[PDB]
Amino acid sequence: IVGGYTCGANTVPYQVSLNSGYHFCGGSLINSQWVVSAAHCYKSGIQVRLGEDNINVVEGNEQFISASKSIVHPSYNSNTLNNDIMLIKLKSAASLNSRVASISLPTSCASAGTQCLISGWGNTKSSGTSYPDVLKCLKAPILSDSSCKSAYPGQITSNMFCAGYLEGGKDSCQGDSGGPVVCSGKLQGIVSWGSGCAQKNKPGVYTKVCNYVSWIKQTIASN
Numbered sequence: 001i002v003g004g005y006t007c008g009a010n011t012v013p014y015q016v017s018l019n020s021g022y023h024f025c026g027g028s029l030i031n032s033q034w035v036v037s038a039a040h041c042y043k044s045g046i047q048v049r050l051g052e053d054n055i056n057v058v059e060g061n062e063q064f065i066s067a068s069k070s071i072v073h074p075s076y077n078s079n080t081l082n083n084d085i086m087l088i089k090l091k092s093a094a095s096l097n098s099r100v101a102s103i104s105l106p107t108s109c110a111s112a113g114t115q116c117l118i119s120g121w122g123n124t125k126s127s128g129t130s131y132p133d134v135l136k137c138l139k140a141p142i143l144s145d146s147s148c149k150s151a152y153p154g155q156i157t158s159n160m161f162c163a164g165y166l167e168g169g170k171d172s173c174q175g176d177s178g179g180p181v182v183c184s185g186k187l188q189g190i191v192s193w194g195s196g197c198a199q200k201n202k203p204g205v206y207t208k209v210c211n212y213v214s215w216i217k218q219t220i221a222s223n
Protein backbone atom coordinates (compact mmCIF):
# COMPACT_ATOMS: atom_id res chain seq x y z
CA ILE A 1 0.00 0.00 0.00
CA VAL A 2 1.50 3.29 -1.09
CA GLY A 3 0.36 6.55 0.51
CA GLY A 4 -1.70 4.73 3.06
CA TYR A 5 -1.48 4.54 6.80
CA THR A 6 -0.86 1.95 9.47
CA CYS A 7 -4.27 0.34 9.95
CA GLY A 8 -3.64 -0.41 13.58
CA ALA A 9 -3.34 -3.89 14.98
CA ASN A 10 -6.28 -6.07 13.90
CA THR A 11 -8.45 -3.17 12.76
CA VAL A 12 -8.97 -5.07 9.51
CA PRO A 13 -9.84 -8.44 11.04
CA TYR A 14 -10.82 -10.12 7.75
CA GLN A 15 -7.41 -9.31 6.24
CA VAL A 16 -5.33 -12.42 5.87
CA SER A 17 -1.74 -12.93 4.85
CA LEU A 18 -1.11 -15.83 2.59
CA ASN A 19 2.18 -17.35 3.52
CA SER A 20 4.32 -20.03 1.80
CA GLY A 21 7.40 -19.40 3.93
CA TYR A 22 6.87 -15.64 3.61
CA HIS A 23 3.97 -13.31 3.02
CA PHE A 24 3.14 -13.29 -0.69
CA CYS A 25 -0.46 -12.14 -0.94
CA GLY A 26 -3.39 -10.81 0.98
CA GLY A 27 -6.77 -12.43 1.14
CA SER A 28 -10.06 -11.82 2.85
CA LEU A 29 -11.71 -14.17 5.29
CA ILE A 30 -15.27 -14.62 4.15
CA ASN A 31 -16.33 -17.25 6.63
CA SER A 32 -14.54 -19.38 9.20
CA GLN A 33 -13.15 -21.82 6.62
CA TRP A 34 -12.88 -19.72 3.45
CA VAL A 35 -10.63 -16.99 2.21
CA VAL A 36 -11.04 -15.15 -1.05
CA SER A 37 -7.93 -13.93 -2.79
CA ALA A 38 -6.69 -13.20 -6.31
CA ALA A 39 -6.22 -16.10 -8.67
CA HIS A 40 -2.79 -14.69 -9.47
CA CYS A 41 -1.97 -15.47 -5.83
CA TYR A 42 -2.46 -19.11 -6.51
CA LYS A 43 0.18 -21.48 -5.29
CA SER A 44 0.26 -24.82 -3.53
CA GLY A 45 1.22 -25.06 0.14
CA ILE A 46 -0.52 -21.88 1.21
CA GLN A 47 -0.78 -21.18 4.90
CA VAL A 48 -3.39 -18.59 5.71
CA ARG A 49 -2.38 -16.28 8.48
CA LEU A 50 -5.27 -14.75 10.29
CA GLY A 51 -5.24 -12.03 13.05
CA GLU A 52 -1.96 -10.67 11.71
CA ASP A 53 -0.67 -7.20 12.16
CA ASN A 54 3.08 -7.33 12.14
CA ILE A 55 3.63 -10.31 9.80
CA ASN A 56 7.17 -10.66 11.08
CA VAL A 57 6.35 -10.85 14.76
CA VAL A 58 4.09 -13.18 16.70
CA GLU A 59 1.96 -10.69 18.57
CA GLY A 60 -0.46 -13.20 20.04
CA ASN A 61 -3.61 -12.91 17.94
CA GLU A 62 -2.51 -15.02 14.98
CA GLN A 63 -4.04 -18.17 13.67
CA PHE A 64 -2.04 -19.95 11.07
CA ILE A 65 -4.09 -22.44 9.13
CA SER A 66 -2.99 -24.41 6.14
CA ALA A 67 -5.10 -24.32 2.99
CA SER A 68 -6.85 -27.61 2.26
CA LYS A 69 -7.96 -26.55 -1.18
CA SER A 70 -7.45 -23.68 -3.62
CA ILE A 71 -10.09 -23.03 -6.21
CA VAL A 72 -9.11 -20.68 -8.91
CA HIS A 73 -11.94 -19.13 -10.82
CA PRO A 74 -13.04 -21.38 -13.71
CA SER A 75 -12.50 -18.47 -16.09
CA TYR A 76 -9.35 -17.05 -14.63
CA ASN A 77 -7.11 -15.93 -17.45
CA SER A 78 -3.61 -15.33 -16.16
CA ASN A 79 -2.66 -13.44 -19.31
CA THR A 80 -5.26 -10.72 -18.80
CA LEU A 81 -6.03 -11.36 -15.12
CA ASN A 82 -9.66 -11.50 -16.09
CA ASN A 83 -11.56 -13.29 -13.29
CA ASP A 84 -8.69 -12.78 -10.87
CA ILE A 85 -10.31 -14.50 -7.94
CA MET A 86 -9.63 -17.65 -6.05
CA LEU A 87 -11.10 -19.30 -3.01
CA ILE A 88 -8.94 -20.93 -0.43
CA LYS A 89 -10.44 -23.34 2.04
CA LEU A 90 -8.80 -23.64 5.42
CA LYS A 91 -7.91 -27.10 6.76
CA SER A 92 -9.69 -26.17 9.96
CA ALA A 93 -12.18 -23.42 10.78
CA ALA A 94 -10.65 -20.17 11.91
CA SER A 95 -11.61 -19.26 15.40
CA LEU A 96 -13.60 -16.11 14.84
CA ASN A 97 -13.07 -13.37 17.38
CA SER A 98 -12.63 -9.57 17.44
CA ARG A 99 -9.33 -9.84 15.58
CA VAL A 100 -10.24 -12.62 13.17
CA ALA A 101 -13.54 -11.87 11.51
CA SER A 102 -15.12 -12.54 8.19
CA ILE A 103 -16.04 -9.82 5.72
CA SER A 104 -19.44 -9.92 4.08
CA LEU A 105 -19.78 -10.50 0.38
CA PRO A 106 -21.65 -7.85 -1.62
CA THR A 107 -25.26 -8.43 -2.48
CA SER A 108 -24.70 -6.02 -5.25
CA CYS A 109 -22.03 -3.96 -6.94
CA ALA A 110 -20.82 -0.56 -5.82
CA SER A 111 -20.93 2.74 -7.59
CA ALA A 112 -18.04 4.88 -8.75
CA GLY A 113 -17.17 7.30 -5.96
CA THR A 114 -17.88 4.77 -3.23
CA GLN A 115 -15.14 4.92 -0.64
CA CYS A 116 -13.34 1.71 0.05
CA LEU A 117 -10.73 0.44 2.42
CA ILE A 118 -7.84 -1.29 0.76
CA SER A 119 -5.31 -3.01 2.93
CA GLY A 120 -2.17 -5.08 2.75
CA TRP A 121 1.47 -5.69 3.51
CA GLY A 122 2.53 -4.78 0.03
CA ASN A 123 5.21 -2.36 -1.04
CA THR A 124 4.73 1.16 0.40
CA LYS A 125 6.99 2.81 -2.17
CA SER A 126 5.80 4.17 -5.50
CA SER A 127 9.44 4.09 -6.59
CA GLY A 128 11.76 1.42 -5.22
CA THR A 129 10.77 -1.09 -2.57
CA SER A 130 9.88 -1.05 1.08
CA TYR A 131 7.75 -3.75 2.60
CA PRO A 132 5.97 -2.89 5.82
CA ASP A 133 5.80 -5.31 8.65
CA VAL A 134 2.48 -3.97 9.92
CA LEU A 135 -0.75 -3.84 7.91
CA LYS A 136 -1.22 -0.74 5.82
CA CYS A 137 -4.57 0.74 4.93
CA LEU A 138 -5.76 3.02 2.21
CA LYS A 139 -9.11 4.70 1.78
CA ALA A 140 -9.76 4.99 -1.91
CA PRO A 141 -12.79 5.65 -4.03
CA ILE A 142 -14.00 3.47 -6.80
CA LEU A 143 -13.19 5.21 -10.07
CA SER A 144 -15.48 5.54 -13.04
CA ASP A 145 -15.33 2.64 -15.43
CA SER A 146 -14.39 5.10 -18.17
CA SER A 147 -11.43 6.50 -16.21
CA CYS A 148 -10.43 2.91 -15.45
CA LYS A 149 -10.62 1.80 -19.09
CA SER A 150 -8.96 5.03 -20.26
CA ALA A 151 -6.07 4.34 -17.88
CA TYR A 152 -5.68 0.80 -19.19
CA PRO A 153 -6.99 0.70 -22.69
CA GLY A 154 -7.85 -2.77 -23.91
CA GLN A 155 -7.24 -4.30 -20.50
CA ILE A 156 -10.24 -3.63 -18.30
CA THR A 157 -13.04 -6.13 -18.33
CA SER A 158 -16.46 -6.10 -16.69
CA ASN A 159 -14.76 -8.13 -13.96
CA MET A 160 -12.46 -5.35 -12.95
CA PHE A 161 -12.80 -1.95 -11.51
CA CYS A 162 -10.31 0.77 -10.68
CA ALA A 163 -10.06 2.42 -7.29
CA GLY A 164 -7.67 5.05 -6.11
CA TYR A 165 -6.48 8.40 -7.26
CA LEU A 166 -5.69 9.39 -10.80
CA GLU A 167 -3.26 11.98 -9.42
CA GLY A 168 -1.15 9.14 -8.02
CA GLY A 169 0.50 8.82 -4.64
CA LYS A 170 -2.04 6.45 -3.10
CA ASP A 171 -2.54 2.89 -4.32
CA SER A 172 -2.13 -0.75 -3.50
CA CYS A 173 1.04 -2.30 -4.80
CA GLN A 174 2.84 -5.63 -5.17
CA GLY A 175 2.41 -7.70 -2.04
CA ASP A 176 -1.12 -6.33 -1.58
CA SER A 177 -2.27 -8.72 -4.31
CA GLY A 178 -5.30 -10.77 -3.36
CA GLY A 179 -6.09 -8.43 -0.51
CA PRO A 180 -9.41 -6.78 0.22
CA VAL A 181 -11.13 -3.73 -1.09
CA VAL A 182 -14.00 -3.22 1.30
CA CYS A 183 -16.64 -0.65 0.57
CA SER A 184 -19.63 -0.04 2.81
CA GLY A 185 -18.83 -3.19 4.83
CA LYS A 186 -18.70 -5.44 1.79
CA LEU A 187 -15.78 -7.10 -0.03
CA GLN A 188 -16.15 -5.37 -3.41
CA GLY A 189 -12.63 -5.75 -4.65
CA ILE A 190 -9.56 -7.89 -4.58
CA VAL A 191 -6.17 -6.35 -5.20
CA SER A 192 -5.47 -7.57 -8.70
CA TRP A 193 -3.23 -5.42 -10.81
CA GLY A 194 -2.21 -2.02 -12.03
CA SER A 195 0.83 -0.42 -13.52
CA GLY A 196 3.59 0.42 -11.08
CA CYS A 197 2.06 1.73 -7.93
CA ALA A 198 0.51 5.08 -7.11
CA GLN A 199 1.53 6.45 -10.48
CA LYS A 200 -0.44 9.25 -12.02
CA ASN A 201 -3.27 7.99 -14.24
CA LYS A 202 -2.51 4.38 -13.35
CA PRO A 203 -5.00 3.53 -10.62
CA GLY A 204 -5.23 0.17 -8.94
CA VAL A 205 -7.24 -2.47 -10.71
CA TYR A 206 -9.36 -4.72 -8.59
CA THR A 207 -11.33 -7.83 -9.18
CA LYS A 208 -14.95 -6.91 -9.18
CA VAL A 209 -16.11 -9.26 -6.43
CA CYS A 210 -19.80 -8.47 -6.85
CA ASN A 211 -19.67 -10.39 -10.17
CA TYR A 212 -18.50 -13.48 -8.28
CA VAL A 213 -20.79 -13.71 -5.31
CA SER A 214 -22.93 -16.47 -6.89
CA TRP A 215 -19.82 -18.39 -7.82
CA ILE A 216 -18.29 -17.86 -4.39
CA LYS A 217 -21.39 -18.94 -2.50
CA GLN A 218 -22.03 -21.89 -4.78
CA THR A 219 -18.40 -22.99 -4.67
CA ILE A 220 -18.19 -22.71 -0.91
CA ALA A 221 -21.49 -24.57 -0.51
CA SER A 222 -20.18 -27.41 -2.67
CA ASN A 223 -16.73 -27.64 -1.18
Ligand SMILES: N=C(N)c1ccc(OCCCCCOc2ccc(C(=N)N)cc2)cc1
Residues within 6 Å of the ligand: 040, 078, 079, 080, 081, 155, 171, 172, 173, 174, 175, 176, 177, 191, 192, 193, 194, 195, 196, 197, 198, 203, 204, 205
Ligand atom coordinates in the same frame (compact mmCIF):
# COMPACT_ATOMS: atom_id res chain seq x y z
N1 LIG B 1 -3.68 -6.88 -16.73
C1 LIG B 1 -2.68 -7.69 -17.10
N2 LIG B 1 -2.68 -8.26 -18.23
C2 LIG B 1 -1.58 -7.95 -16.12
C3 LIG B 1 -1.17 -6.91 -15.27
C4 LIG B 1 -0.17 -7.14 -14.32
C5 LIG B 1 0.41 -8.40 -14.25
O1 LIG B 1 1.40 -8.63 -13.34
C6 LIG B 1 1.55 -9.88 -12.64
C7 LIG B 1 0.32 -10.22 -11.80
C8 LIG B 1 -0.21 -9.06 -10.96
C9 LIG B 1 0.63 -8.93 -9.69
C10 LIG B 1 0.17 -7.78 -8.80
O2 LIG B 1 0.55 -6.58 -9.45
C11 LIG B 1 0.04 -5.36 -9.09
C12 LIG B 1 0.45 -4.26 -9.83
C13 LIG B 1 -0.03 -3.00 -9.50
C14 LIG B 1 -0.90 -2.85 -8.42
C15 LIG B 1 -1.40 -1.48 -8.09
N3 LIG B 1 -0.70 -0.42 -8.49
N4 LIG B 1 -2.49 -1.32 -7.47
C16 LIG B 1 -1.29 -3.95 -7.66
C17 LIG B 1 -0.82 -5.21 -7.99
C18 LIG B 1 0.00 -9.43 -15.12
C19 LIG B 1 -1.00 -9.20 -16.05
Ligand SMILES: [Ca+2]
Residues within 6 Å of the ligand: 052, 053, 054, 055, 056, 057, 058, 059, 060, 062
Ligand atom coordinates in the same frame (compact mmCIF):
# COMPACT_ATOMS: atom_id res chain seq x y z
CA1 LIG C 1 2.19 -11.39 13.55
